[PDB]
Design a protein around this ligand. Structure first.
Ligand SMILES: Nc1ncnc2c1ncn2[C@@H]1O[C@H](COP(=O)(O)OP(=O)(O)O)[C@@H](O)[C@H]1O
Lengths: 413, 147, 98, 147
């Protein structure tokens, strides 16, 4: 890598992944590899990727987040599905009025164990943004405060009969009444600062004329990404895994190390969160409320998706290569046709692990109490988009199912 | 145009000293400077922007932040330099005489030995180059060349 | 003559007298011309200090007085405040390893 | 101590803004600071000199002159640093607590990346070394060593 010099007897290498099929290439324009700088940096996460900086034909750089060890083919395919997804959104008039567009980024699977991912320039990590905005005083309230777990959580495991750090969740679901867990969750969420993103944006926008726009745009982006992910892109919504574009306010999906189903089949980290609608996002639309812009845009999006299902359903047959795919696609088509998201998540659990001593209590958690969770009332199948979305909302933001979620998947942000 | 608001001015009243952030003025002042119609407005705007860019330079040398990241006022420079450029070699003789010398002076400063290395000069050079490549502003080409 | 009086209390009281607005004028030049009148032979050995004190304490109510002298710090370093003990004690007075 | 009078202060009255040159105070203020007898005078002088050296640093960073000869306030630094040093590790506990940290802070600043190369750091190092070699001020040796 150090000594790349453009030379004859060597076919010039064009920058990986610079083709998008919206038209004939004009293949001369593409920037081609021209040596690349030092100062590779790591990204500080498990399976440490690093960040190459390729400079090419044009002296403008092109950071590409080299990453290995994973069968990135998964990421490639899922990104392609967002591509078709974004198409289907655009081709409608109702949705396009509001110019909804998921943001895709080039995924270029280089081999079985390597593939570049174009760094999105001028963007920051959602938890990076959050932590960045918080006052240096309260910064200690996440780094280390008397409630040593970010808010009391790891300690509260002990209070819920869970002794060790890993797997102790496997016990709490036994004696977790709808109250003490919920009350605890209220508390821990409360301690976390409020008006976070609001502060970030207020810092961002020039004049209050702009805050409303940027807020609408952030809300729309996060909303659309969330719903599209519920279609398929489930799982692993670590606050590292949502990027926010400092420049323009978009929320861009990031990692897909677990696609649909891959979230919850993987037992040691059981997950019952379909969306990410944790507190700071609610508090953003402060005077309004969830079921404000976000729920409406949910309704619109989901109504769009189901218009011609085959375009997206009968597109994720790329899993040609029992068969796990032959059934995860079935769950997908079930949800698109309309199933109580509680039901689909319950089925996901039922297939997920029937050998654990919790799947009774896991299923019970998923369903939610009939008294105070609007998900449990709906029929298992045959749902109208209004109902589908609303049920899914409650399933996402339910304090109970939220509160007992995995550490790391920081449910308070 | 900037995360945090530099260009802190202290409009010097008598009984007190309030602070007015000149950066919020700038994105609209510049648009006036390039494309205003009423020439009195345009020349006034140009003279304001000259003053204001001079203030940028000044507040730069009163470095509040010596690197360890993006240099301060770099983010401002990136979007004020193309303004300064294509506003030079505009076709108002007054503006031309006012800004062509300043662009020359800026180019001069940004290869003075002190901070010859800084990303600010990187940006200004990048601006001049994207000034050469300018597709439509035909006359901008020549001034960028001289630059 | 009182402006040098032995008791610090009356010192402050008489000085505050002579610095109220209607006694010595409030702008600078009118102060500087006034202080020449605030002199007697006996107030001499202190008259310099007294003039300086008057002039500067009129500086004291000008708007730049609390405005920090230099706009920016010279780094990002965190700044704390510490008080100095100063408890009627000097440095070579407590024997070493107790 | 300096050909031309830096340390320009603008004692901020209301009706006007006169300029007072703090450098003329300094050669006598420092002598007070080291060797005053009346301890109220001494501590007051020490606190003045702390303020005044801080002002030196400040007026330095507002560089009016970027080299091309003797750096400004170098001539001042050469003769204020030995003062600052041997006035640290004096035997007044108040002065000690006031200046030992400042000398540490000065040493810190004068190897910050920005102007790590400057003759100012050369001078300060030369001062510390001539502080080691100090013949009589026995205790000065140790502080200079720590420095
Ligand atoms: N598209 C992108 N552009 C820039 N940085 C990114 C991008 N995607 C991820 N990152 C960085 O990658 C880190 C996450 O790594 P990720 O891709 O999630 O793999 P893993 O699942 O192993 O963390 C984030 O902290 C973020 O800083």
């Amino acid at each position: 890598m150090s000594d790349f010099k453009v030379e004859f007897l060597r076919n010039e290498l064009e920058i990986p992944g610079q083709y998008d099929g919206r038209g004939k290439p004009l293949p001369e324009y593409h920037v081609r590899i021209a040596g690349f700088d030092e100062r590779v940096t790591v990204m500080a996460s498990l399976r440490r990727p690093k960040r190459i900086i390729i400079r090419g034909h044009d002296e403008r750089e092109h950071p590409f987040l080299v990453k290995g060890g994973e069968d990135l083919r998964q990421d490639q395919r899922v990104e392609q599905l967002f591509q078709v997804m974004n198409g289907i959104l655009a081709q409608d008039s109702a949705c396009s009025q509001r110019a909804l567009q998921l943001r895709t980024y080039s995924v270029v699977p280089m081999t079985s164990r390597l593939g570049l991912i174009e760094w999105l320039e001028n963007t920051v990590t959602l938890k990076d943004l959050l932590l960045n905005t918080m006052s240096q005083e309260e910064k200690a309230a996440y780094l280390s405060d008397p409630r040593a777990p970010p808010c009391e959580y790891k300690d509260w495991l002990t209070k819920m009969s869970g002794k060790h750090d890993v797997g102790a969740y496997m016990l709490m679901y036994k004696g977790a009444n709808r109250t003490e867990t919920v009350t605890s969750f209220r508390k821990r969420e409360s301690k976390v600062p409020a008006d976070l993103l609001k502060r970030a944006f207020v810092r961002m926008s020039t004049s209050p004329e702009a805050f409303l726009a940027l807020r609408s745009h952030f809300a729309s982006s996060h909303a659309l990404i969330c719903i599209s992910h519920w279609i398929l892109g489930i799982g692993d919504r670590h606050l590292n895994n949502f990027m926010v574009a400092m420049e323009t306010g978009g929320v861009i999906g990031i990692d897909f190390g677990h696609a649909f189903g891959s979230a919850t089949q993987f037992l040691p980290v059981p997950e019952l969160m379909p969306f990410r609608l944790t507190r700071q996002f609610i508090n953003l639309m402060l005077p309004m409320k969830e079921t404000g812009l976000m729920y409406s845009i949910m309704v619109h999006a989901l109504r769009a998706f189901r218009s011609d299902p085959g375009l997206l359903t009968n597109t994720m047959d790329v899993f040609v290569k029992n068969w796990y795919p032959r059934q995860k696609i079935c769950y997908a088509k079930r949800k698109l046709a309309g199933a109580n998201p509680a039901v689909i998540t319950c089925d996901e659990l039922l297939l997920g692990h029937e050998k654990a001593p919790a799947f009774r209590d896991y299923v019970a958690v998923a369903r939610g109490s009939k008294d105070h969770n609007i998900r449990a009332q709906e029929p298992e199948s045959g749902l109208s988009e209004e109902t589908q979305v609303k049920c899914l909302m409650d399933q996402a933001t339910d304090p109970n199912i939220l509160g007992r979620t995995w550490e790391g998947w920081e449910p308070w942000m | 145009w900037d995360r945090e608001k530099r260009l802190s001015f202290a409009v010097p009243f008598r009984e007190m000293k309030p602070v007015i952030f000149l950066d919020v003025f700038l994105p609209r002042v510049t648009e006036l400077a390039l494309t205003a119609s009423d020439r009195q407005t345009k020349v006034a705007a140009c003279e304001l922007l000259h003053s204001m860019v001079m203030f940028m330079l000044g507040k730069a040398t009163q470095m509040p932040e010596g690197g360890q990241g993006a240099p301060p006022m770099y983010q401002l420079y990136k979007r004020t330099f193309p303004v300064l450029l294509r506003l030079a070699c505009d076709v108002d003789q007054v503006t031309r005489q006012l800004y062509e010398p300043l662009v020359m002076q800026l180019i001069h400063w940004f290869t003075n030995n002190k901070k010859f290395e800084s990303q600010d000069t990187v940006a200004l050079l990048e601006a001049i180059l994207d000034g050469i490549v300018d597709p439509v502003d035909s006359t901008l080409r020549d001034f960028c060349g001289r630059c | 003559q009182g402006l040098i009086d032995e008791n610090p209390g009356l010192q402050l009281i008489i000085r505050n007298f002579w610095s109220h607005e209607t006694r010595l004028p409030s702008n600078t030049l009118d102060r500087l011309l006034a202080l020449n009148s605030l002199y007697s032979p006996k107030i001499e050995v202190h008259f310099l200090s007294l003039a300086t004190n008057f002039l500067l304490e009129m500086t004291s109510m000008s708007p730049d007085y609390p405005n920090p002298m230099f706009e920016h710090p010279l780094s990002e370093c965190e700044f704390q405040e510490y008080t100095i003990d100063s408890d009627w004690r000097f440095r070579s007075t407590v024997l070493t390893p107790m």
